[PDB]
Amino acid sequence: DPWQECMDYAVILARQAGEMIREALKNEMDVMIKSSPADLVTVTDQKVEKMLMSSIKEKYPCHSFIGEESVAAGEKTVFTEQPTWVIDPIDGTTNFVHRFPFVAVSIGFLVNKEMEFGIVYSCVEDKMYTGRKGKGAFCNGQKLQVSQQEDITKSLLVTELGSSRKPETLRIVLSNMEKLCSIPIHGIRSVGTAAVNMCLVATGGADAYYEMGIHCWDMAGAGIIVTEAGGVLMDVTGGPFDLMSRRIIAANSITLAKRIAKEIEIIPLQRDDE
Amino acid sequence: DPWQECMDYAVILARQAGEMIREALKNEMDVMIKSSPADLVTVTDQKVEKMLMSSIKEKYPCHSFIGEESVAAGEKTVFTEQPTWVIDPIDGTTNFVHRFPFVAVSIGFLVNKEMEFGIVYSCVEDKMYTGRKGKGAFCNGQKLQVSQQEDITKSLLVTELGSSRKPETLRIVLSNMEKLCSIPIHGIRSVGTAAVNMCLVATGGADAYYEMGIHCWDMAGAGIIVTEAGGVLMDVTGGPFDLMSRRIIAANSITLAKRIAKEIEIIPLQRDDE
Ligand SMILES: [Mg+2]
Ligand SMILES: [Mg+2]
Ligand SMILES: [Mg+2]
Numbered sequence: 001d002p003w004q005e006c007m008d009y010a011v012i013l014a015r016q017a018g019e020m021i022r023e024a025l026k027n028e029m030d031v032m033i034k035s036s037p038a039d040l041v042t043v044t045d046q047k048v049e050k051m052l053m054s055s056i057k058e059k060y061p062c063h064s065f066i067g068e069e070s071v072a073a074g075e076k077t078v079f080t081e082q083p084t085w086v087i088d089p090i091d092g093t094t095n096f097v098h099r100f101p102f103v104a105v106s107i108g109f110l111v112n113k114e115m116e117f118g119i120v121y122s123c124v125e126d127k128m129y130t131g132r133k134g135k136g137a138f139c140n141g142q143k144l145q146v147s148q149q150e151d152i153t154k155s156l157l158v159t160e161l162g163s164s165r166k167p168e169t170l171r172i173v174l175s176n177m178e179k180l181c182s183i184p185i186h187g188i189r190s191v192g193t194a195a196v197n198m199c200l201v202a203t204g205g206a207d208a209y210y211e212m213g214i215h216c217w218d219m220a221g222a223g224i225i226v227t228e229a230g231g232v233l234m235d236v237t238g239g240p241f242d243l244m245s246r247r248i249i250a251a252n253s254i255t256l257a258k259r260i261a262k263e264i265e266i267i268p269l270q271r272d273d274e
Numbered sequence: 275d276p277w278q279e280c281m282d283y284a285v286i287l288a289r290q291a292g293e294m295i296r297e298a299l300k301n302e303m304d305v306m307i308k309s310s311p312a313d314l315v316t317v318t319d320q321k322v323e324k325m326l327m328s329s330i331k332e333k334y335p336c337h338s339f340i341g342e343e344s345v346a347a348g349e350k351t352v353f354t355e356q357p358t359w360v361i362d363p364i365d366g367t368t369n370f371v372h373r374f375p376f377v378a379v380s381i382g383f384l385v386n387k388e389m390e391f392g393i394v395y396s397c398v399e400d401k402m403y404t405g406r407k408g409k410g411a412f413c414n415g416q417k418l419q420v421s422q423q424e425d426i427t428k429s430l431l432v433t434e435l436g437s438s439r440k441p442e443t444l445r446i447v448l449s450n451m452e453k454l455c456s457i458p459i460h461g462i463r464s465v466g467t468a469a470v471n472m473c474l475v476a477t478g479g480a481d482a483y484y485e486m487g488i489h490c491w492d493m494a495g496a497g498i499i500v501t502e503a504g505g506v507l508m509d510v511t512g513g514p515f516d517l518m519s520r521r522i523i524a525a526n527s528i529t530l531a532k533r534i535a536k537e538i539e540i541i542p543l544q545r546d547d548e
């Protein structure tokens with residue numbers, strides 16, 4: 001009702017951003033590093049974020065904004081109940097730099113710290129994923145539904161190794177994969193983008209996604225797409241989902257989400273709001 | 275060009291197989307296990323192989339045939355100089371059972387024990403990959419070229435955890451991923467199919483692919499696609515590529531392939547010809 005016009009505008013912006021990404025893919029890139037040698041950024045990430053943030057500020061000046069590259073530039077995240085846009089200009093910068101065909105624009109929109117709508121545009125494959133509270137989840141006009149698989153022994157999981165090259169984090173990430181593989185499970189997949197990995201849970205192609213070390217902007221868009229497809233969001237502890245906690249289990253069911261949580265050793269991480 | 279009419283027929287068959295797969299995806303499946311609880315097979319794998327084997331035998335009765343499900347039924351692999359069709363009716367059965375959108379039909383054609391042509395049809399995304407000796411590599415008519423990245427530190431790799439749930443094998447698989455991640459590299463991806471992972475190297479989306487435990491039918495199709503895109507095939511030791519060895523490094527260059535090989539601890543495996 002008051003937010004549908006925001007969602008309609010956000011889809012138009014996601015498409016403009018996808019055109020910018022696809023155009024930069026045709027050209028040579030200057031690749032910069034951020035927190036680690038595997039944490040990449042390009043001028044495209046910065047240019048896309050500047051376009052999105054300027055476009056939303058002009059149309060909705062009283063709204064709040066949280067963006068991956070704005071935080072990298074020094075802007076401090078202060079999460080409120082306020083209408084908030086949580087942007088990831090290029091989710092999958094490593095994929096983008098390499099031309100690995102899964103690169104997304106993620107636009108999340110929160111009211112009362114709860115997800116209202118989310119847009120995840122997988123721009124190379126031209127797949128527009130959308131979710132809106134009580135309105136359903138879609139991919140290019142196709143309504144989405146999570147899988148029915150509650151048995152972990154017959155489960156297919158999506159995850160990422162992460163950008164961290166810190167020895168102890170890498171050890172915990174790999175040990176958690178080993179614990180899950182040993183249950184046993186049917187397998188683990190990685191397309192290289194948190195948002196697209198979560199959208200694969202929403203379509204029912206994967207049963208669950210889990211990750212530690214991601215940020216609010218990686219999951220704000222896809223989070224509502226999973227829940228509107230019939231899925232659940234949970235903290236890796238089994239506790240209620242926390243957007244600023246850097247941790248998530250996005251699953252088809254509570255049963256599977258709780259089962260995954262029992263296998264995960266937590267990585268110590270600085271919160272997005274600390 | 276006698277091998278061109280075979281290649282034209284192989285494309286038509288791969289499309290027919292793709293249709294049988296996409297149709298089976300709409301229905302409920304009875305899932306069976308083979309070597310481990312994560313080594314899956316369905317009636318579709320068997321029905322697709324029967325259609326492929328029958329269709330080639332009718333058109334090319336003098337030709338030899340090796341197929342995944344035929345070997346599982348007890349047919350012994352005797353690799354000769356004869357024109358041989360090497361079939362993987364559904365490459366990515368775990369993906370197929372789960373509706374994870376990367377499921378391929380792989381058809382490899384060899385003459386004088388050398389890859390002539392290869393077809394890899396990623397049927398859910400409708401991506402037809404082809405390669406033919408001295409004729410180039412294509413995806414839906416678009417000519418393919420491997421990446422220029424020889425520096426491992428700026429490399430994006432593709433691999434799979436494998437179907438084995440044996441603790442020691444899983445430990446070696448994960449220990450190799452840890453060694454590679456620690457170099458450091460840009461990252462690791464897993465779409466859940468050897469043939470599609472190999473095709474991502476051919477497009478230049480990934481810089482290299484490595485795996486142990488796969489079979490001749492997993493790589494006969496995609497092998498010639500990688501080399502026709504300008505890439506290299508090598509053993510996981512650095513040694514010459516051997517189709518029956520159950521091991522591969524499919525890379526953009528010898529430099530990168532040799533570098534990955536230095537990091538890999540071998541898993542003991544029974545050859546496809548033993
Ligand atoms: Mg980003
Ligand atoms: Mg991201
Ligand atoms: Mg980033």
Ligand SMILES: [Mg+2]
Pocket residue numbers: 313314315342367
């Ligand atoms: Mg199989």
Ligand SMILES: [Mg+2]
Pocket residue numbers: 319342362363364365366367
């Ligand atoms: Mg197969």
Ligand SMILES: [Mg+2]
Pocket residue numbers: 362364365366468491492
């Ligand atoms: Mg296979």
